[PDB]
Write a protein that holds these residues in place. Sequence first.
Motif, PDB file in Angstrom:
ATOM      1  N   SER A  97      -8.907 -23.696  23.735  1.00 22.09           N
ATOM      2  CA  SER A  97      -9.535 -23.756  25.193  1.00 22.09           C
ATOM      3  C   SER A  97      -8.615 -24.203  26.109  1.00 22.09           C
ATOM      4  CB  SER A  97     -10.904 -24.626  25.088  1.00 22.09           C
ATOM      5  OG  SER A  97     -11.653 -23.835  24.079  1.00 22.09           O
ATOM      6  N   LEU A  98      -7.383 -24.966  25.841  1.00 22.06           N
ATOM      7  CA  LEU A  98      -6.523 -25.342  26.862  1.00 22.06           C
ATOM      8  C   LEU A  98      -5.935 -24.095  27.762  1.00 22.06           C
ATOM      9  CD1 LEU A  98      -4.487 -28.163  25.613  1.00 22.06           C
ATOM     10  CD2 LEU A  98      -5.678 -28.101  27.894  1.00 22.06           C
ATOM     11  N   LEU A  99      -5.909 -23.095  27.067  1.00 19.80           N
ATOM     12  CA  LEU A  99      -5.162 -21.851  27.909  1.00 19.80           C
ATOM     13  C   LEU A  99      -6.050 -21.335  28.917  1.00 19.80           C
ATOM     14  CD1 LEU A  99      -4.371 -20.280  24.406  1.00 19.80           C
ATOM     15  CD2 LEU A  99      -2.588 -20.551  25.925  1.00 19.80           C
ATOM     16  N   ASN A 100      -5.305 -21.341  30.113  1.00 19.54           N
ATOM     17  CA  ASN A 100      -5.832 -20.758  31.494  1.00 19.54           C
ATOM     18  C   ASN A 100      -5.716 -19.136  31.349  1.00 19.54           C
ATOM     19  OD1 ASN A 100      -6.909 -22.901  32.677  1.00 19.54           O
ATOM     20  ND2 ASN A 100      -4.816 -23.827  32.997  1.00 19.54           N
ATOM     21  N   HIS A 101      -6.519 -18.470  32.226  1.00 21.18           N
ATOM     22  CA  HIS A 101      -6.606 -16.988  32.055  1.00 21.18           C
ATOM     23  C   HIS A 101      -5.456 -16.435  33.028  1.00 21.18           C
ATOM     24  CE1 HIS A 101      -8.291 -13.178  32.842  1.00 21.18           C
ATOM     25  NE2 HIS A 101      -8.088 -13.382  34.119  1.00 21.18           N
ATOM     26  N   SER A 102      -5.204 -15.139  32.710  1.00 23.19           N
ATOM     27  CA  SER A 102      -4.370 -14.273  33.561  1.00 23.19           C
ATOM     28  C   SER A 102      -4.738 -13.117  33.282  1.00 23.19           C
ATOM     29  CB  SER A 102      -3.001 -14.470  33.514  1.00 23.19           C
ATOM     30  OG  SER A 102      -2.422 -13.469  34.237  1.00 23.19           O
ATOM     31  N   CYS A 103      -4.940 -12.069  34.171  1.00 21.74           N
ATOM     32  CA  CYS A 103      -5.208 -10.661  33.880  1.00 21.74           C
ATOM     33  C   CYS A 103      -3.725  -9.834  33.382  1.00 21.74           C
ATOM     34  CB  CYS A 103      -5.910  -9.726  35.002  1.00 21.74           C
ATOM     35  SG  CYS A 103      -7.317 -10.634  35.767  1.00 21.74           S
TER      36      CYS A 103
END
Lengths: 10, 426
Positions: B200-206
């Motif tokens: 859950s540490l990973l942030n989002h990118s499209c």
Amino acid sequence: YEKFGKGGTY
Amino acid sequence: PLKVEKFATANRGNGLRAVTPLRPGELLFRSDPLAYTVCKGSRGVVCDRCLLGKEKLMRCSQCRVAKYCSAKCQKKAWPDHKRECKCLKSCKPRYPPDSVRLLGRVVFKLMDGAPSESEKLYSFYDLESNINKLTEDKKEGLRQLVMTFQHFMREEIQDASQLPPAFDLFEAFAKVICNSFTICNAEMQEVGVGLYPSISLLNHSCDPNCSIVFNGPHLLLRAVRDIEVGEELTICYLDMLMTSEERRKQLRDQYCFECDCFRCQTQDKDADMLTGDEQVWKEVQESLKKIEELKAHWKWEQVLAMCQAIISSNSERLPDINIYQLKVLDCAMDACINLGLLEEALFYGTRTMEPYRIFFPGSHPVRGVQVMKVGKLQLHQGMFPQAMKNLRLAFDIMRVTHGREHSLIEDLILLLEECDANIRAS
Ligand SMILES: Nc1ncnc2c1ncn2[C@@H]1O[C@H](CSCC[C@H](N)C(=O)O)[C@@H](O)[C@H]1O
Ligand SMILES: [Mg+2]
Ligand SMILES: [Zn+2]
Ligand SMILES: [Zn+2]
Ligand SMILES: [Zn+2]
């Protein structure tokens, strides 16, 4: 007694 | 020695970044869930433990709710199932929302003294809740989940003094809502939901540089591009077949941020996704609500009947690259595979190949699996050169997205070897 969560079928 | 590390980003909270340079396909992390559950539509279709489909599942005799493929799965699932068994029994046929059942499993894991490997980088108590950003309608929904949990769990837990004092039920549901992961099976059907706190540490990118894939409940995180030392690692929280407006709405509503990534700021691919007349494709979009609900419950005959009506009626007007028509073709292909209509499945699946090449650029596990399904259909229908080309393409993708740690690679190698044998036999 809906849809949450990262990712999915696509 | 870890290739990834937690760090504080400027404006996005905590994140994960590369310790060493990373190559496409490199395995970064792997995790079992802290807790997980089969999802609503798949319960009784797939094993509660291993999340595999079987024609015959056996019920827990105590609640008659949990179902297992084998006595081995039933016994290995008992520690996780023991405290929810009585709760599931009380409410049968009524059944708790997936988030409630998941959090019921989480709370007892938190009382383990042994460190959970799933929490190595980040723990449940570290998870972002966005509690100060939530809208009033969202807070009301969370208050409703709290009351549902308190009722569902009442045989086991009657008061907050029976749970750790740092645990807060309202904030726990807020964490569950923005940190859960949908678990997909090998065929990319949604079968489950779980918490994986380090992931859950990973942030989002499209346009992410990493990708996750599931092997049963087990999660693999892989780089899908070259990544420099110190570069932040990202994944896509969303389905790829969504316009930038749809993506921004879901990210704002669920995750409480406004996505400023390159694709959202530039409307990248929106025009292609919306190809055709809106009066025509808005009808498909609306029909998809029911189709996707039927697919979630594995009702394949009903899926296929709805899809065929749409596909035949729009053939003169709406191109396959339109994302709503594309989703209908994909639902039709999967329904046909599951029903054994293999010639019809190939007809729909072939039509998805070029749209998938456009909308899943680089290496994405969804395209890898889709291309593998089409190559497998071509192989068994005796079109060997075409099948060989697609199976080779699938392997090029899936060596990056799946890797040798995922069992689907061995299946693909067997198909490649069989296709090659038919080609040599002429
Ligand atoms: N692209 C992005 N832009 C802004 N915030 C983001 C983002 N991706 C993820 N987030 C944030 O991260 C949350 C999901 S969990 C990802 C880890 C989180 N930043 C943390 O500190 O624990 C989101 O709800 C939002 O707060
Ligand atoms: Mg408390
Ligand atoms: Zn099983
Ligand atoms: Zn039971
Ligand atoms: Zn974006």
